[PDB]
Structure 1
Amino acid sequence: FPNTISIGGLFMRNTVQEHSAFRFAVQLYNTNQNTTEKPFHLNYHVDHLDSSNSFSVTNAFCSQFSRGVYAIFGFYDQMSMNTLTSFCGALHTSFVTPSFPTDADVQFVIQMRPALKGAILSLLSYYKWEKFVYLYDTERGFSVLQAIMEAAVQNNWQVTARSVGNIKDVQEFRRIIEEMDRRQEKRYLIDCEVERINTILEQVVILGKHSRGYHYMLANLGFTDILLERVMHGGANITGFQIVNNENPMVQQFIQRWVRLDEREFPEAKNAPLKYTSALTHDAILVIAEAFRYLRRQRVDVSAGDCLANPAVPWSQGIDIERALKMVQVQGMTGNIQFDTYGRRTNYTIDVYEMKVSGSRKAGYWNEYERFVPFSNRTIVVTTILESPYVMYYEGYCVDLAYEIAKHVGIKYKLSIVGDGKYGARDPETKIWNGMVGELVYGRADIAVAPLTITLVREEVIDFSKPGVATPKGSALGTPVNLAVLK
């Protein structure tokens, strides 16, 4: 068995705290005095790669491979995931990563990040969500999206799915929020990156939808990195998922020893909140150390060419190292760590937090076997037209009719005069309705108590009561308004 074991490290951009955690964990493993805990020295060959250039990624991976490594700890993005995964699976080199788990079943990859699909489904079942929105981007895989769609089909849910990964203008976010609010959707499920979640939440705050009655389920293990002070001040319900529990004594020790690090040699240390990815990196170091100690104990011989060989010769010892890595049983900052045959984590203990007015609170926890266990009248827009004797400065015949109708039906109504001041007609060129007909067809109003003449063209886009009151087609107010008009 070698006296010193070297591993490769692959870090992307915007990844500085994780690098510090990696180096600090290696230093901690080396510094251990007990020979049993540290039977061999550990070395790293950290390198930085740009996922936007596959050539550079291949060169970095091949430098790591040629220099001689036993395992590679690295990050991959949706762009560079394929290259690293395929090369690692082809050359028989285990790849420990804390990034998003791969959708497909691939060997020689150990993913430190637990999957959120089961927890999300369990929370949706617990909260009894039968109809909601799902704003998603495909930067962490399609597993969650496919699971949500399959569950909705099976359970006959009403999920409004929207891909927000390609949106670069916040006005589109505002339009989406307004359109979905007009449909009376109180429940959102945001499965996006931290910055995208922040943008969506801030657009919500400006739109003023953070009041009571709104529930936001942030499907991201970045609850600490999400800015929601405004939203908690609003009073809306927020549900989040986390894996690093501050009450764990190991986490407390790691944090207390992590703060005293100088910001020069360990940048970002003791400056910003500890990202969960850093905990995953520390746990990855622990997993590698335990696996290699197990390999040494069992007296397994371990001991490099080029990536591009037509007769690709895999390591005879690669399978042994992969098996040793995947059979590990350790306790780390993220709890129990166990991997199945495909390198995915098992025995999750995801902490489910329910944000309260005072602050964040632990709602409960989710495990693979115990499932989830807890720790415990809108104003209706009435579009009208300014025309005597129907509407005057409001008072008039139509105002009285609207008051009577809103009395016969149980509703609260707010009048609004159409900005363009037109009754309505289809433009022959652009096929765009205007006036109150346009307001009703496009959902900007719920009812039009105005002298709208009943016509064949209009009857095909909206529903008229008896001699008439107009409503958008398919609305729930059609029959009540008709009956009120009768009486």
Structure 2
Amino acid sequence: THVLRFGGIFEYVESGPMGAEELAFRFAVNTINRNRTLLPNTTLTYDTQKINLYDSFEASKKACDQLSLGVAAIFGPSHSSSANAVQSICNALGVPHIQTRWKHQVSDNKDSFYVSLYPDFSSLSRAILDLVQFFKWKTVTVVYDDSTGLIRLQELIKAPSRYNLRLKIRQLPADTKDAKPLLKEMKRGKEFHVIFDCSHEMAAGILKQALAMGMMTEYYHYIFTTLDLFALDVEPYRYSGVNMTGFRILNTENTQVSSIIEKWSMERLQAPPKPDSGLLDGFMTTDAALMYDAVHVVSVAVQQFPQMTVSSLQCNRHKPWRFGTRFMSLIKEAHWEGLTGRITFNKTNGLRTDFDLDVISLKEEGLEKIGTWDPASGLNMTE
């Protein structure tokens, strides 16, 4: 057999229940080592470690401790500041780094030992621009959460340079969950079409706030850049007539993915979120799905090269892994059809710039897919 171990750095929430990404990582390794189809002899081992996600030194220490122990891959923390340091450590010591969240990559950063399964926001911004094109929008407003959102929507912000759009870029107030003043100053300008660049939780929050204000009508259209739009309590919004739209990468249409999501929902019920939050119950966040997909993709990559040996690399001396370049290359060339559709990393840099999105809009019966999106092909509306 094998004692292959994957390193995982996740958020530390002592007061609350276990995190979604870490629980999905455990679920994925359990599925991999239980299903007698992938990695028959190899059995995955847990090396979960918890950090605060906002202290790069703690994450660096945890990653160095993991690499000192037997670890074949690092599943990076979902924060830019921590993940940058973690991938720098991994690149220096040659261990592959896997990221399941978007991190702003510096153009001059010469790091090669990292692959991110979150869809690249260049392609996602192109998809949002294609949505804006399809609706014949002229004057639009963008409402982002963090300054990095401007980076996440640069291919859409740059559109008026070449297009005839009219961006009215706004931002939700920081350190405050109240989006009421922004909506108040937004209604005065008659902003019919709005693009929201916030997380699904705060997207639901601002939707509830707008409904309390009576903002949305039959004449208001919303596009959400979050991929967790399907996991929203849209029942208060069924017949309101709002033209809500968004993207979704979790391939819930496939029966296998649906069964996996249902098993996730029934297994993850120790401490569900509060019902008065605006999110459903039988749902899987796209970050958990991407963690599952990442574990499976790394399992596929290691399957083709079974002669690996797990080392005890130390951070004190830069010792590249004996098999770190080959494993990294196979991970970058690994293809797998999983929860978030087809996974294919770009060869130039390790990112998912080729993915299959589904455009889900608010019909009269919940949120239903109205087409697909493929970077090679473009918008594929069928209805």
Whether TM exceeds 0.5 here: the answer is: yes
Name the CA distance, whole Å, in 2 between partners of 1:49 and 1:139: 23
Please tell me whether Structure 1 or Structure 2 has the larger radius of gyration of its CA atoms.
1
Whether 1:110 and 2:115 are equivalent positions in the alignment is: yes
| Deviation (angstroms), 1:214 | 0.2
Name the CA distance, whole Å, in 2 between partners of 1:70 and 1:81: 17
Equivalent residue, structure 2, for 1:72 = 74
1:160 maps to which of 155, 168, 184: 168
Name the CA distance, whole Å, in 1 between partners of 2:297 and 2:326: 15
Equivalent residue, structure 2, for 1:21 = 24
Name the CA distance, whole Å, in 1 between partners of 2:33 and 2:365: 42
Quickly say closer, same or farther: Cα 1:271–1:216, change in 2 above 3 A: closer
Gaps in structure 1 of 5+ consecutive residues: 377-487
* Residues 186 and 215 in structure 1, CA contact (< 8 A), matched pair in contact too: yes
* Residues 242 and 352 in structure 1, CA contact (< 8 A), matched pair in contact too: yes
Quickly say closer, same or farther: Cα 1:51–1:25, change in 2 above 3 A: closer
Quickly say closer, same or farther: Cα 1:233–1:192, change in 2 above 3 A: same
Quickly say closer, same or farther: Cα 1:138–1:93, change in 2 above 3 A: farther
Equivalent AA in structure 2 for residue 10 of structure 1 = I
Equivalent residue, structure 1, for 2:294 = 284
Paired residues for 1:3-22 under 5 Å: 3-13=2-12, 16-22=19-25
* Residues 17 and 268 in structure 1, CA contact (< 8 A), matched pair in contact too: no
Equivalent residue, structure 1, for 2:222 = 216
2:134 maps to which of 126, 131, 134: 126
| Deviation (angstroms), 1:343 | 1.3
Whether 1:147 and 2:155 are equivalent positions in the alignment is: yes
* Residues 356 and 374 in structure 2, CA contact (< 8 A), matched pair in contact too: yes
Paired residues for 1:14-413 under 5 Å: 16-34=19-37, 37-104=39-106, 106-115=111-120, 116-138=124-146, 142-164=150-172, 166=174, 168=176, 170=178, 173-258=179-264, 261=267, 263=269, 272-296=282-306, 303-309=311-317, 312-341=318-347, 342-376=349-383
* Residues 225 and 247 in structure 2, CA contact (< 8 A), matched pair in contact too: yes
Moved >6 Å (runs of 4+) = none
* Residues 194 and 221 in structure 2, CA contact (< 8 A), matched pair in contact too: yes
Quickly say closer, same or farther: Cα 1:59–1:256, change in 2 above 3 A: same
| Deviation (angstroms), 1:78 | 3.4
| Deviation (angstroms), 1:101 | 4.2
* Residues 353 and 364 in structure 1, CA contact (< 8 A), matched pair in contact too: yes
Name the CA distance, whole Å, in 2 between partners of 1:141 and 1:159: 14
Name the CA distance, whole Å, in 2 between partners of 1:167 and 1:69: 38
Question: Equivalent residue of 2:184, what SS?
Answer: helix
Name the CA distance, whole Å, in 1 between partners of 2:2 and 2:226: 41
Name the CA distance, whole Å, in 2 between partners of 1:60 and 1:330: 29
Name the CA distance, whole Å, in 1 between partners of 2:73 and 2:363: 43
Question: Equivalent residue of 1:331, what SS?
Answer: strand
Q: How large is the RMSD of aligned CA atoms in angstroms?
A: 2.6
* Residues 10 and 53 in structure 2, CA contact (< 8 A), matched pair in contact too: no
> Per-residue displacement from partner, 1:390-447 (whole Å, max 9, x unpaired)?
xxxxxxxxxxxxxxxxxxxxxxxxxxxxxxxxxxxxxxxxxxxxxxxxxxxxxxxxxx
| Deviation (angstroms), 1:18 | 2.5
| Deviation (angstroms), 1:168 | 1.8
Equivalent AA in structure 2 for residue 119 of structure 1 = A
* Residues 313 and 319 in structure 2, CA contact (< 8 A), matched pair in contact too: no
| Deviation (angstroms), 1:135 | 0.6
Count of matched residue positions in the alignment of Structure 1 and Structure 2: 366
Question: Equivalent residue of 1:148, what SS?
Answer: helix
Quickly say closer, same or farther: Cα 1:199–1:253, change in 2 above 3 A: closer
Gaps in structure 2 of 5+ consecutive residues: 274-279
Equivalent AA in structure 2 for residue 248 of structure 1 = N
Name the CA distance, whole Å, in 2 between partners of 1:97 and 1:165: 28
| Deviation (angstroms), 1:182 | 1.8
Question: Equivalent residue of 2:81, what SS?
Answer: coil
Equivalent AA in structure 1 for residue 299 of structure 2 = A
* Residues 100 and 141 in structure 1, CA contact (< 8 A), matched pair in contact too: no
Name the CA distance, whole Å, in 2 between partners of 1:293 and 1:169: 46
| Deviation (angstroms), 1:263 | 4.9
* Residues 101 and 116 in structure 2, CA contact (< 8 A), matched pair in contact too: yes
Equivalent AA in structure 1 for residue 254 of structure 2 = N
Quickly say closer, same or farther: Cα 1:28–1:188, change in 2 above 3 A: same
> Per-residue displacement from partner, 1:161-194 (whole Å, max 9, x unpaired)?
1132625262xx3232222222222011110122
The worse-fitting range, judged by mean Cα deviation, of 317-326 and 178-187 is: 178-187
Name the CA distance, whole Å, in 2 between partners of 1:120 and 1:195: 20
Name the CA distance, whole Å, in 1 between partners of 2:36 and 2:231: 36
